[PDB]
């Protein structure tokens, strides 16, 4: 869940508050739809897709699902106890967080008009 995703972001990208990613480009935070403004938006886009596939697993709700994971000494790990759904969700978030840590951050792309630059 987004509390855990939050904590994931906070442990892979220390220097930057998680809020910085809650409203960026067309796919970070606010729904989406349209071409990702940039790499950091692409990370999120892939992340939105991951959630949609996960939604295919019945009784699987990407935002409220609580999975098992840990982050220590710079290592983000999805534990083995997770069922199919939790595992998927965990890995979605995990891949995203790692993606965030390697992508540039453009301030011009923070909180852009959604309605006019994304249908």
């Amino acid at each position: 869940n987004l509390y855990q995703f939050k904590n994931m972001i906070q442990c892979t990208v220390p220097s930057r508050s998680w809020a910085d990613f809650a409203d960026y480009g067309c796919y970070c935070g606010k729904g989406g739809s349209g071409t990702p403004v940039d790499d950091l938006d692409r990370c999120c886009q892939t992340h939105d897709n991951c959630y949609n596939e996960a939604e295919n697993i019945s009784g699987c709700r990407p935002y409220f699902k609580t999975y098992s994971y840990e982050c220590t000494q710079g290592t983000l790990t999805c534990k083995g106890d997770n069922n199919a759904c939790a595992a998927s969700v965990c890995d979605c978030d995990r891949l995203a967080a790692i993606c965030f840590a390697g992508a540039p951050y453009n301030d011009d792309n923070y909180n852009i008009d959604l309605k006019a630059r994304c249908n």
Partner: peptide, 5 residues
């Protein structure tokens, strides 16, 4: 309160 991505 709410949602990142």
């Amino acid at each position: 309160l709410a949602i990142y991505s």
